[PDB]
Design a protein around this ligand. Sequence first.
Ligand code: GTP
Ligand code: GTP
Ligand code: GDP
Ligand code: GDP
Ligand code: MG
Ligand code: MG
Lengths: 432, 430, 56, 47, 425, 426
Amino acid sequence: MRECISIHVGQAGVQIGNACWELYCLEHGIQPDGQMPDDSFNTFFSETGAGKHVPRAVFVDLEPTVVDEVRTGTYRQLFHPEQLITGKEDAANNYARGHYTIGKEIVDLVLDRIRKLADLCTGLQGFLIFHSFGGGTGSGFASLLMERLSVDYGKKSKLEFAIYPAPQVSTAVVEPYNSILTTHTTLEHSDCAFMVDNEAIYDICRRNLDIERPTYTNLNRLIGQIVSSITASLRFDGALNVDLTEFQTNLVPYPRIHFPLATYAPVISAEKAYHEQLSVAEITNACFEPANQMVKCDPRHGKYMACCMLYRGDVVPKDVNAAIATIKTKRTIQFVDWCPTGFKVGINYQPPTVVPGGDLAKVQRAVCMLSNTTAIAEAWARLDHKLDLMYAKRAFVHWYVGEGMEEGEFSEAREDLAALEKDYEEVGVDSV
Amino acid sequence: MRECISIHVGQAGVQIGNACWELYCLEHGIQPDGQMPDSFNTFFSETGAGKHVPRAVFVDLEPTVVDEVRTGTYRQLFHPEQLITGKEDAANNYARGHYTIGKEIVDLVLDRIRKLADLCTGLQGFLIFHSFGGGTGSGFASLLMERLSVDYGKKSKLEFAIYPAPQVSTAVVEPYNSILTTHTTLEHSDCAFMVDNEAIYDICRRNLDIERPTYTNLNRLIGQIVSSITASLRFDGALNVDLTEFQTNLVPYPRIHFPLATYAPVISAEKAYHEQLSVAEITNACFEPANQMVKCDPRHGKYMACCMLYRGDVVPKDVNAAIATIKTKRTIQFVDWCPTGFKVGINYQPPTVVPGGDLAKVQRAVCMLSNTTAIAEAWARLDHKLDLMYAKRAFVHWYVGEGMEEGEFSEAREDLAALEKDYEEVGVDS
Amino acid sequence: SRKRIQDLSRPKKQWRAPDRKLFWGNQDPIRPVSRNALKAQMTQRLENLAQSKEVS
Amino acid sequence: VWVGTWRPHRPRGPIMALYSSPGPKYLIPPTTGFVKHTPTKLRAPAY
Amino acid sequence: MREIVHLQAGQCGNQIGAKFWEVISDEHGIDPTGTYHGDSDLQLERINVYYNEATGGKYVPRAVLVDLEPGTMDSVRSGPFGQIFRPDNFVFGQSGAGNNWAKGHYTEGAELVDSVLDVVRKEAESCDCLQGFQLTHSLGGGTGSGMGTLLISKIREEYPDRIMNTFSVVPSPKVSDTVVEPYNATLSVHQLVENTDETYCIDNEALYDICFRTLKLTTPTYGDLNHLVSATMSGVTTCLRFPGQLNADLRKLAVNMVPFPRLHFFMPGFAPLTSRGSQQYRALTVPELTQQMFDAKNMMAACDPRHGRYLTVAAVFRGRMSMKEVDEQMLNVQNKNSSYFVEWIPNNVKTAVCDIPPRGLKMSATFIGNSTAIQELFKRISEQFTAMFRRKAFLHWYTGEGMDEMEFTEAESNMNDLVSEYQQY
Amino acid sequence: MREIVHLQAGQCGNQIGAKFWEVISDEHGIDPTGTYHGDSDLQLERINVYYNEATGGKYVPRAVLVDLEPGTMDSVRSGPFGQIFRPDNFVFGQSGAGNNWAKGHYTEGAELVDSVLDVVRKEAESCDCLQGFQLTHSLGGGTGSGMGTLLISKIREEYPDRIMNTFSVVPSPKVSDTVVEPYNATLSVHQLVENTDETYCIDNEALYDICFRTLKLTTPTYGDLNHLVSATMSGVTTCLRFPGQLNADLRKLAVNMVPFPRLHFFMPGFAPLTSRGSQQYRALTVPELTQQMFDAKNMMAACDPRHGRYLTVAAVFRGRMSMKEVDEQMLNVQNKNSSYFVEWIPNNVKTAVCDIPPRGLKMSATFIGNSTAIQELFKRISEQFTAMFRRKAFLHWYTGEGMDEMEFTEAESNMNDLVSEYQQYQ
Ligand SMILES: Nc1nc2c(ncn2[C@@H]2O[C@H](COP(=O)(O)OP(=O)(O)OP(=O)(O)O)[C@@H](O)[C@H]2O)c(=O)[nH]1
Ligand SMILES: Nc1nc2c(ncn2[C@@H]2O[C@H](COP(=O)(O)OP(=O)(O)OP(=O)(O)O)[C@@H](O)[C@H]2O)c(=O)[nH]1
Ligand SMILES: Nc1nc2c(ncn2[C@@H]2O[C@H](COP(=O)(O)OP(=O)(O)O)[C@@H](O)[C@H]2O)c(=O)[nH]1
Ligand SMILES: Nc1nc2c(ncn2[C@@H]2O[C@H](COP(=O)(O)OP(=O)(O)O)[C@@H](O)[C@H]2O)c(=O)[nH]1
Ligand SMILES: [Mg+2]
Ligand SMILES: [Mg+2]
């Protein structure tokens, strides 16, 4: 009826899933070791006749070094032993190897696990791809799995929660090669792509939250929390329910323009909101800050075209439109002329949970703002600049063509990204 | 529904706000922790548990004052975001105050001001606490209120700033930079009170029996007048006056907007168990030449518009006789173009006393607000003291080395001469 | 000296443009349509933004 | 609006309640690196 | 003996009909168990209009519960008055349409219609005579605006003469709730004009203004908002269920109200609306009811009476009053502000007086109006549609599931003709 | 059945008219809750001249409580008679008034005037027969002086034949609690001269002199000032409520009082005033009121009546007195002061004898006088105006908010015309 399948792959995806299933077990009465000490757990969990609940996700990786700790640690009691797919050799920051030579082979088990996970669920709703844009297993293997899922399942919805290279913070050097070369594959066979990066989450954890020296667990728990409200209405009753398939006909005006942002406003420490009243009119007004975004873009130079607000917990349905109307009256948030309506509202009846002892503060309100803007077009200009400076002398092409395929796909990047850059300019031109 | 926003810029404003935000805590009933053991809304918002939020922002570029405030007994009262520190001092420079280091931190203090103004419904004005001498209170507050004007518009701004005292000072460049401070005042400010330091010393030497006065007594005596301004805003009374007409009934012309301040019954606690003051002489206790908070003699100019806010057990019968006998004498002189002269304000709350303090428990207490033509001399001497330094181009190299120009000084001298001409022209009779 | 009196009598200069006065219970929008996207806009040649079918 | 003999009276000047706080408009400097840091973080050393 | 069958589709229609079946079970005295617990007779001799019988004194409502998203089924089933509905009319889809008209009408919404027409026909074949078709939905949703229009097209193509009633909510002018509101709003009700004969436009910002500045509620929720609509819903069909001195049924609320088959758009109302802080300071009389009936503060639509000119007015009164002060007050309404009424119709009001006022109050009224200011709403909807249409802004979700470019142009042409013919009169 | 609608604008107006309902509800024996607990039955017959009805026998007055600041509704609702009004009859604002003309007339007040005519038409259309409108305000501020003067224009054109009973507190020659009083007086009584039909000019200075000198208060509070005004306030409309040997309604106190449409400014009063310790010393007789009635030291306006003549004189006698006396003494005072009455009007005095006096007194009186001596008040207001206009003292504060220069000139011209007509017929 209302089940969904989320695919975790790479390292960023598997660590995000490691943090996310903590929250998924905490929302319901499911213990971390599977059992319980009600039909709202069918979206993420299946039921076995002995009381064991089995998750509906997959953990696939070409290295064993990060799936071993799941297979040996706190959560080896939860996940399916054959869904814990491990590889042999790393893709090693290479699109070509993990797309053509080693990533081509192991999908005969990945797709089989996806099939057996899909034969339990009756009303399947969509796919949540959890990977990263700048690796070999994240950007090459998940891309090929997305090709195969698109050519097999047809018109099922596909969503991407992926790690985007920050303008300054970047741990690898082959990022623009296997990041842009994924975008030939994404926008043809995708419906939305909720990008995040790592610098903006550092800024949020540092300034809004007050944690110093943050490990990856803080970022991954924030990611799990913002994707916890994207499927809030699929499992929890609410006054204004917004299911999964009506996200795309609200966020996507054009099939090319399906690259939205993401924002979770009530992210704050325990001893900061204790000196605060957290009214509705000052939470959704904080979703529109440039300092609250999970991707480094400036919405002051961007032009909003679609929006969605997915409220949680004790939200009065009256102050929501009173908070939207004052936004409409202010001139700091400008829309395009061909969208005179703008907004979309969803209200739920469940407060956001907090991990016990975690950095987040307990509240009974939660706002997730999803919107696509023309300011994302600058996030592609910098990667195009990087590829133009790096491919000009054929920097790292020998590691790519050494798997057996030509460099023509690198030459296919410039016309495709030039079209994606100039049509974004075209759809934001005023009426003249 | 009667909100006021308080900004404390520089040390000379934060050190006064320290006294003000304990006086306001005692006036209502909030232990400095912030919790409680319905008219407090004009300085406090609420939480679910019950703490109260001071609607004030504490900003300076030196982290010393806010750091010792954070370690004190106000850590629970305040939010860690109104306590905005800085890395490096404004270094006694009008240039450095708002151009290199002070240019950037505006985008954080204004964002916090914006978050403060959204939680209130009846915001009226701005309570900026600064000084005319240094660089943080004179340069940063300059540009800050300058773009407050483009941020809000007709919402009034009330600075409570101190003056260079006419024969004592601490900094040497005080007249060199105080003139440059007022280049933003007469177009982005409507009423800025002038309360210097030397006259408070004379007041606490004569009217009080106290010896070796510290800055604390001056801050408390200023904060008493500041709290008496918002007396009718918080409480009930016969003649309720707020900030909106305070803009109008006190200021005749847009440039002529620098009035005085005077608190009459500052009588020692040791002399308080014998005498009980009355209205007919507490009105004369405001107009004495030795009872005021700026070292300027009032005979040097004719009065323009007076405003007295009587607080406590005051009946409006005898304030009439007080103004009537004020009009009769000769030393108190008004202008010919103001037959009406005055403005009467009456409240129902006597002033609060502070434990371990200096002031006494009096019944009636009048706060006097007035602008006079005598302050033209208080600008004329600061002008001449800048002219003596500028004749040899004394400290110019410490200002043009940061981003200002001599071409800015060439547009800077003549406006204060124009202001002297304005005061001289408005002082004459027709 | 009278011209100086006229000079002080000039009131002031404003900075914030006043916000828009809105009326409720009417069928008017908050942000007006610019009337050039109404019936003056024309589509472009590369506006091939149609529905992407299944695979073939 | 005037679709008869009745019309609404028009105020001649702006209302003081219109002059409200502008929303999200200020960019607040980042907290990563050296090119632009807030003076509220203890900065990390460059080398 | 004289029945009305109720239908609802979508979250909006379902959660309005839930409050409807609460309030009209309360007027007739039916507990959520399903027995009879009223303490009169006049609420029991005409109960078959909205209910059926069962063994042991079980009163089963006559409603049809449909939605392509089954999420609201569990909410209305596990609500307060959710255990009276029979478990066979609960037909649901598995894949929600989700604010797309094509999924609600053509390719998925039409596949569940063969299951809902069976239940509608089975309900309509157990009544002595049919008079109305009551539909509640949303005008710019996906399943409410998609398959409700298909359902009423099928009903009108099979039952030709029976009057049908939509109680639908329309998109608000100030705040927007969906980006595809103009597309569904324009393209679904250009099959409302050529099919229906009595429709009721309800806004949501006007209901909020009623709850805030008239009822004076600090926390007005949706459960307290659909009761306000359900009051007018129950008040329109009052003379069918209770006796009175001037009895008007729904058919006589059509000839006196609809002069032309296109101009049939009505804005509902409910008179005795006041806060409990001034309930005792007023006296519940006919003059204040007829004063507040023709006020902008007691209407469910954001169209002022100023913008146009009233064509027909209906006003159903309940309680024990006399009729000449009622008729005299209607005359003073017509004569005082005669610039807001049409000259070419002499009498512009229709009055009906019942005998049983609702519980609690001693009298009540229900206001239904026809005016040439509803065209201002369609002007705004056509404005938004033409702004979003020519850039092909959201036609991607339409043209890939059996659409055409020219169909939108036909809908906009019909809307322009409707606004022109409203202006002409 | 003959109804009067009450309006109060500004906190001064709301204070002077809030106590006005205390002397009426106690006159009709109405609880502060609203119920009836009196002893007589004559005071209940004509109670639909000021009040309305409610189920269960509660009585709610008609009133349009109007202000620009919400700082009054926490006080007048919490006063002695706060529970008697109607919550839907309250009209408020958000921003401050500022005591200026622009925020009562053009910018803030012009927003609020559409929502005050809603409740004016709420009350004025639920009555049987309407006489006119009752309004309390001042002449030296921004709310009552400006916005109420806008409100008389927004009411007058809707009801062209009814009467406008305004009640003005005029700035005093020696005491002023506002610095922009001459501006707000000239701008008000420029337009007040051609809409309302009778204005009762009241000075705080003369009324304070009455309180200090006649009935011997040492400490006069504002409530004891408003009570003395409210006695006259309720003394004018006493023929609408109680029987009398010589009835004279509000319209009869409008025809006989003005000889020309623009000379309609009245000096009020109240005769039987005595000290606290001398109430039970003797019975009050009719020859000892006219001496208290026709003296300069009883007048509520600071203009000395002996600096001019009297055009039309009123005497609303309340109590059980004879009629030969209350005409013989009027003849005697007409013959006694010939130079204080005009020559071309033969009878200069109107008498109206009611029956019911207020509670606490077995007899009472009320004086309304239209004398030429009030031209002294306009002259000093004009001179105080031109003192601030030869040099444009506060024109900075008006001209920046829609005001323009020469309407002050034409308002001063209008004052000069009013002075010349008031002197010309003397
Ligand atoms: N925020 C966040 N980012 C992560 C995390 N783990 C990995 N990343 C990001 O992933 C990027 C590396 O790309 P990956 O896709 O993980 O590379 P891979 O999966 O190891 O595949 P290969 O590079 O071929 O070995 C880094 O730049 C990180 O920014 C995580 O736990 N949290
Ligand atoms: N009343 C009072 N005055 C003070 C206090 N501290 C300093 N002052 C006065 O302020 C003057 C110094 O100029 P300021 O504007 O305060 O200097 P600043 O605020 O530290 O700004 P910078 O020097 O640039 O850091 C001195 O002449 C003192 O008279 C105080 O705590 N209370
Ligand atoms: N005013 C009001 N509107 C409602 C209520 N419930 C739902 N809505 C409206 O209904 C619309 C959603 O329609 P929906 O039921 O989702 O259409 P569907 O997807 O085809 O079933 C939204 O635009 C809301 O404005 C309610 O209780 N009051
Ligand atoms: N006599 C008298 N005068 C009053 C009373 N209350 C206020 N005033 C006068 O009202 C004047 C101020 O008018 P104000 O209320 O500020 O005008 P507004 O604010 O525009 O309504 C002062 O000069 C006072 O003398 C009162 O109870 N009695
Ligand atoms: Mg890897
Ligand atoms: Mg300093």
